[PDB]
């Protein structure tokens with residue numbers, strides 16, 4: 001995300017706001033632009049657009065607005081002290097205490113990003129909008145999934161590009177971010193997949209719309225201009241002249257992964273899937289014979305596997321993604 005975070009985002013934000021949302025941001029980026037990755041994610045999908053809208057509407061039906069959903073389900077905004085406390089408790093719970101550097105920042109386009117600074121893992125947490133019941137989920141996403149998968153993957157024959165080719169691996173995504181997103185909302189009482197759904201939706205529209213149009217369009221789902229600005233930039237990462245239609249479709253991966261994993265949950269071995277590293281749920285049978293599983297780590301929330309599966313059922317119910325609908329969506 002560092003490469004596609006516009007170098008002039010602030011100056012263009014002030015311009016946008018000060019024009020009362022009529023101006024089209026003219027973004028610039030650190031040269032050179034990752035042309036290959038831009039081209040890979042230049043087209044948006046609509047495969048799950050009705051699921052996205054289904055989730056969004058389910059939230060707004062129950063909570064009226066996002067604003068109330070956030071405050072009612074998310075809990076209080078956290079101080080730095082409270083964040084560190086929750087993180088420390090989590091690391092110990094996961095048995096990875098002292099392995100990851102934790103940093104607090106205001107300039108993240110997401111809640112948190114797991115990185116490799118100084119050839120070492122770094123968890124950057126956005127202090128802006130960090131909330132009690134939500135933060136624990138972020139840690140299940142970034143540490144419980146991304147980090148543990150990463151460490152397990154480093155131990156496997158397919159730990160690098162060559163290894164992936166040699167063993168014939170499908171891409172890690174959408175299985176990676178699908179698993180991570182399900183894990184974020186795992187133990188919540190109202191586990192609505194708002195973030196995933198709205199990202200999916202925003203990209204779909206971004207492909208057709210200017211920035212101005214996209215920003216206005218989102219008003220129907222979320223009022224806060226700052227929140228909307230985030231979603232718009234994420235959807236138009238890499239776009240220079242945002243007056244034209246176009247998107248960076250990467251963030252559609254979350255909902256895409258969720259649907260697929262939930263659809264096939266009955267045949268997926270979730271411990272094994274995590275143990276094999278950065279692998280697709282489809283590659284599990286292919287790679288099982290060649291995986292080294294002696295000292296691979298499974299997240300703490302997967303130990304009671306019966307309960308884990310119940311949570312997945314609860315997540316489907318909540319998000320209006322019942323078995324029958326998943327069945328019709330993917331007749332696999």
Ligand SMILES: [Zn+2]
Nearest residue numbers: 141146177180
């Ligand atoms: Zn992630």
